[PDB]
Amino acid sequence: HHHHHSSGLVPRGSHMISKINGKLFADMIIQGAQNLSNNADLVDSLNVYPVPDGDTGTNMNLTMTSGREEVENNLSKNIGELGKTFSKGLLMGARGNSGVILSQLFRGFCKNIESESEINSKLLAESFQAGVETAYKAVMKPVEGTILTVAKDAAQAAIEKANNTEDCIELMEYIIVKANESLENTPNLLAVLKEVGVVDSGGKGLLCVYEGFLKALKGEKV
Ligand SMILES: Nc1ncnc2c1ncn2[C@@H]1O[C@H](COP(=O)(O)OP(=O)(O)O)[C@@H](O)[C@H]1O
Ligand SMILES: [Mg+2]
Ligand SMILES: [Mg+2]
Ligand SMILES: [Mg+2]
Ligand SMILES: [Mg+2]
Number of C-beta neighbours around residue 76 at 10 A = 18
The residue type of 13 is G
Distance from the Cα of residue 78 to its chain's centroid? 19
Q: What is the resolution of this structure in A?
A: 1.1
Closest to 113 in 3D by CA, of 98, 101, 137, 129 = 129
The CA distance from 205 to 197, in Å, is 17
Whole-number Cα distances in Å, 148 to 26, 98, 104, 205: 23, 10, 11, 12
Residues with CB under 6 A from ligand 1: 47, 49-51, 53, 55-56, 59, 96-98, 101, 139, 141-143, 146-148, 200-203
User: Which residue is closest in CA terms to ligand 1's atom 18?
Assistant: 96
The pair phi, psi for residue 119, each rounded to 5°, is: -125, 155
Closest to 138 in 3D by CA, of 92, 107, 93 = 107
Cα of 145 from ligand 5 centre, angstroms = 11
The CA distance from 137 to 134, in Å, is 5
62 Cβ contact list (under 8 Å, min separation 6): 93, 95, 99
3-state SS class at 20? strand
Cα of 97 from ligand 1 centre, angstroms = 4
Whole-number Cα distances in Å, 180 to 19, 112, 199: 25, 25, 10
Angle between helices 96-112 and 147-162 (to 10 degrees): 20
Contact assessment for residue 29 and residue 205, using Cβ atoms and an 8 Å cutoff: no
3-state SS class at 119? strand
The CA distance from 193 to 143, in Å, is 13
The CA distance from 130 to 78, in Å, is 19
| Topology of the domain covering 22-218 | 1.25.40
